[PDB]
Design a protein around this ligand. Sequence first.
Ligand SMILES: [Ca+2]
Ligand SMILES: [Ca+2]
Ligand SMILES: [Ca+2]
Ligand SMILES: [Ca+2]
Ligand SMILES: [Ca+2]
Ligand SMILES: [Ca+2]
Ligand SMILES: [Ca+2]
Ligand SMILES: [Ca+2]
Ligand SMILES: [Cl-]
Ligand SMILES: [Cl-]
Lengths: 236, 236, 5, 5
Amino acid sequence: GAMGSMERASLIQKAKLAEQAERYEDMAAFMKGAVEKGEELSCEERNLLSVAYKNVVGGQRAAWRVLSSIEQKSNEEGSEEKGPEVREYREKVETELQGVCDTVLGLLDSHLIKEAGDAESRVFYLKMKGDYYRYLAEVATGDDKKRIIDSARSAYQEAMDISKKEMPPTNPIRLGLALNFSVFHYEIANSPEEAISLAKTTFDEAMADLHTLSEDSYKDSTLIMQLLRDNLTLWT
Amino acid sequence: GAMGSMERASLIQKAKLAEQAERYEDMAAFMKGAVEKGEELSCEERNLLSVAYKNVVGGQRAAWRVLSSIEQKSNEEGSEEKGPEVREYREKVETELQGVCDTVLGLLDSHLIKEAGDAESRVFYLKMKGDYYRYLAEVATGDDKKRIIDSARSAYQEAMDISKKEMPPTNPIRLGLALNFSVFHYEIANSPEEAISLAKTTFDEAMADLHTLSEDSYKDSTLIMQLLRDNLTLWT
Amino acid sequence: FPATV
Amino acid sequence: FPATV
Ligand SMILES: [Ca+2]
Ligand SMILES: [Ca+2]
Ligand SMILES: [Ca+2]
Ligand SMILES: [Ca+2]
Ligand SMILES: [Ca+2]
Ligand SMILES: [Ca+2]
Ligand SMILES: [Ca+2]
Ligand SMILES: [Ca+2]
Ligand SMILES: [Cl-]
Ligand SMILES: [Cl-]
């Protein structure tokens, strides 16, 4: 580990600096080093980990989609042959994306999930596992594609089961998990009705619990509820 | 060279794809490979080279400024001691920035400038040399800082001399060179009056030549003239 | 694309 | 910052 000689606290400090500087690759490398110290992560630290890799993979996904679109157009009737370069470069970006996903999944498996006993931490990590298998599924076309989709589904489902038992319906982690699992249903599993049902039920159950919340918690929960509504509007 | 096995034309094609995907590090690596093939660059190819590295170093400069500001605040009276991490991380970013600048300067010196005989190509590369020495000067604090500034000045001045002899006052390369050299005067050489005089004279001489231009050339030249005006407005 | 967090 | 190209 390149970060093996740096103090845990220094890695966390530098991850925060990297965030401020919009240096997300560095942020992710610092947080990987912090995870590899072997200690559990606090709430704030889990968030730094997730933000770093979300931004790295998000950029890769956006690039992959641009390149995939160019490649699709090149294979249309009447398109002039331009050689192997578009496919090669799309493949390069894809391989790098898969590498990042494998790295995140590796951190979760060694050993974040197994040491997470509180509902909030376990759900957070299982959501991440679902998300990164979902990103692998976005680019999958071979014989393991079904197994990748099922891996995402299984992680999301375990997270959902815990969240429903252990967390209030307004809890932000619970809400964000549901938002993302609903997108999984719509975009990956070809289950738009399940996606819509999950988003609606999640929204409605959260609405009914808002009365219990402080002003600050209300703000957080309603922001995420609006994302559920936005997706519902897109889909209906 | 990692790109040694890839065709020149393929590297150029992939640089264009990388640009479309906003993958500027890849774009720059492809263009480095293309330069290292040893052949001169066309206008379009020179532009790809410049765009790639401009975006890479621009991101580094923005990050460096964020980190430098944090570091400055940490050294103010009443600031709590937070250890060596801010300096270390600023130094990391700085070293990476210097590495990119050294790479670009190396391409120019081996052997783009010496093989550039047409005024347009030679001025383009000498502008780049001035720019990348300017970026080195932005972060320089040691005993070679004066020499770095003088290297920028010398490259810009040679470019200016050629541009005035060989190119019309509306030529975009001539205009952009003048814009950047004016910024060098203001921000690096502590010569705001020289900066203002150069921007004004450049603007006015271009204005007087616009009547010679097609609609398309007029658009290009007036866009750059507006940048000169913007800087003048900032400085007066 | 739809919203995720 | 001032404009450069
Ligand atoms: Ca160690
Ligand atoms: Ca320690
Ligand atoms: Ca592949
Ligand atoms: Ca535990
Ligand atoms: Ca070769
Ligand atoms: Ca060849
Ligand atoms: Ca240094
Ligand atoms: Ca030549
Ligand atoms: Cl490639
Ligand atoms: Cl560092």
